[PDB]
Symmetry: D2
Subunit: 254 residues, 4 copies
């Protein structure tokens, strides 16, 4: 398997549509041993993770909770056994209050709302790296999820700003991670039908055409595969960077 013998933490499962769920499934199919983290509704999340190919410890992690972050490494070590470390970490976490999204006027989002979104969607990438690098092996890999924010667009509004911040954060996390022999990268995914897409983006409210190899919004697997590629030993010279799993859409104007 691509990830045989690798110990990987995966955050961000909320439903079986979650990009993180597919990342977890594919990683398990590829031999990885997982530690999962979930936010808020852990009982409900556990029922979802029970549907994964293999058993995995589920740990609670609210990235705005300083104690959760402080205790994370210790709780992970308890789950994987003393003397063992992680080889991979997946940040698949985002949030933005409704005022910062959709048809709500860009100028009307209060800073308190924007700040919450940036905390959860961007700063927390640094928080998780801070918490977990001390228990990561050399050759390890941290991967976060991105949506190309290089151009403005309808609806994505302040989440675009949060992703621009996340890209910059990733470049600095790479400088820290390199001290541990660890890579840090983002995967910029095209649109996928997830809860966030439905409840956050859709609640607040061309890709296949542009993508030379097409794009299926109902299929998170190609994105999951791309994350697994970064978690593997097969992109060993790439860090601080962004890999686009978007069908090539961002490389085409029409």
């Amino acid at each position: 398997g691509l990830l045989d013998g690798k110990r990987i933490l995966v955050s961000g499962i909320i439903t079986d549509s979650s990009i993180a769920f597919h990342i977890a499934r594919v990683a398990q199919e590829q031999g990885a041993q997982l530690v999962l983290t979930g936010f808020d509704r852990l009982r409900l999340i556990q029922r979802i993770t029970d549907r994964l190919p293999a058993k995995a410890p589920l740990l609670e992690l609210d990235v705005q909770n300083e104690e959760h972050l402080a205790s994370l490494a210790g709780r992970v070590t308890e789950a994987i056994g003393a003397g063992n470390k992680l080889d991979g970490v997946v940040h698949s976490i985002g949030f933005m209050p409704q005022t910062g999204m959709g048809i709500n006027p860009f100028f009307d989002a209060p800073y308190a709302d924007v700040s919450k979104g940036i905390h959860i969607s961007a700063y927390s990438y640094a928080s998780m790296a801070k918490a977990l690098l001390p228990i990561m092996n050399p050759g390890g890999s941290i991967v976060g999820m991105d949506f190309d924010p290089s151009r403005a667009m309808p609806a994505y509004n302040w989440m675009t700003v949060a992703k621009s911040a996340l890209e910059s954060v990733n470049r600095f996390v790479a400088r820290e991670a390199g001290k541990y022999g660890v890579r840090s990268n983002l995967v910029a995914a095209g649109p996928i039908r997830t809860l966030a897409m439905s409840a956050i983006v859709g609640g607040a409210l061309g890709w296949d055409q542009r993508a030379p190899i097409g794009w299926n919004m109902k299929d998170a697997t190609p994105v999951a595969k791309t994350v697994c590629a970064l978690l593997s030993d097969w992109l060993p010279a790439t860090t601080g960077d962004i890999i686009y799993a978007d069908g090539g859409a961002h490389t085409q104007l029409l």
Copy 2:
């Protein structure tokens, strides 16, 4: 008179080294009628602005103060006369706490500090646009100051993240401003000796900050095909004035680099 008859708001003057001070000076040399905004040290800033070529009204603006923002357009209108609107707005404002800068570990900056910096340095570009677009004329121009954050680097740390956010904010402000026939752009400047350079950046570099800033300039000037002088804000001020003028009428949501060309060269 590049800006003859234009009414332009300029924020960000704190000393006569401020990039905003030179923007104001050059704009007045080019015929602009200014309204200035200052933060915190209003008595001192008034003395500074007395050193500008022409008299200009000074208004208080703390961009974290909701009341200041809510009253801003009315206060500007009082300053320029009823029925008159602005043709230009200059955002030349930033802040980051020391924990977010320099040799202080990147991971050790608390979010409260990072958030304050992002509020002042990035969100406030949207706040200022929100406040002032209702009193801007078609053909108008909003300009903010940037430092190219497309790559990470020593010391700039969380301010790099704030500038990355600011660039994104600018692209959305352009969408809103277009409804008013107004452009929104950033000028990404090379390093200039200002109070922020000395007190924020320099303060966080530890001992021999002076030598490190000298080395930064040396590298920048080497990389820049036309060279770079960190003691001279005039080239940056002229660039901002170009964007405030009628001579870049088809540019919006964009970034103009006033950096000697350094960002175009690897070595």
Copy 3:
């Protein structure tokens, strides 16, 4: 009082009064510049066109594929602007790609001889012109070329996109050379404008063409809108770069496209 008062500027690329170069020339003269013009092939026609400008400027022949023309260029310019005078600006507004390299013609079917001709005229010649003219430019001077953002592929532009990608790279190296003379080098990436090249080269290779959709999409993306029939905003931007008001910008690209490239949709 003009933006370009007292400046001596060479402008290449006029073929009709719709040429981007024609509008650049017009605005530059309105702003006090003294021009020397260069033209390719149809010189008598070009002379008739330039009789429509505010002031009649000398026209020099320049086929950028002709080594003899390039070798004699600086001397001919100096005679036209008067010995003792140097240039303050140079405008490269030149491009070409054979039909095989454009439109609905298959990308893979363009022979290298055709692609190479297009790259010679559209990209290499920016270096050729800088080589010829830098020795007669004043410090503070400005070389400007015309670009069309090639960072993403698109229908129809095909191999011209490749030539523009090459041109952007050439510009960054010309900036290194030009800096030795205190001269800036930059490109203006313009949105779509109804010119002879748009009609004859682009439109011609589109076959059964009538571009309307291109205009509508561009104007929709551009937060301040975009008018394909109006070259003036592009001409103004070029004049900004020729002026003293962007003195710290070189090796760069300024986008005069209504902001379209900053918006996804």
Copy 4:
């Protein structure tokens, strides 16, 4: 151990055992790929070099400026892999620029005939090879070319930088064509590697300003790379190419993957 198990892959660009293409071929074979190799001009030497690979692989002649070679390529490949079989992968690891276009030679003094030859071999031929080989590629297939980030100018690289800028653009159009076949096209932008191609850049540069500039660029690369950069180690670049050849980056095309230690993401 089997990243490319069962995949048939063409690898161009081996001239020495220091060639990036040699290491690509080596790593691909380690991962189960069945290769066909192509070489230019010195075919006897290249055959002896390719005998040093972990497994045997047929060698074909290909001068990318030779229209006849390109026209016969698909048929010669099919002869090598057997009728009814197709390629799953293609590696373009080919570059050339005449001496006038590189190094201490002034940028303005390179004649267009020289620049054009370099662009022909280094950029246009990516399209040439895709045109020839797409009709014999399977869906899910992958074409990969080698890039050196040309987004900023730099000392010595001169007209090759222009050729790479052209190659990046070509790749985006090749992706449009390749997509019709269900095939991806991407470039790997590698950091500097001490292949025997280095003399093309540093040749004659000692004592000249360019000499120190080239070394400064190389040392700066390792400095900027958050995980460091070893110019003597082609393996990480080879692995990256293999990742693109694999089934594990199925949604990436018209794109550039940077195998450079992360250096391009850091200003200092």
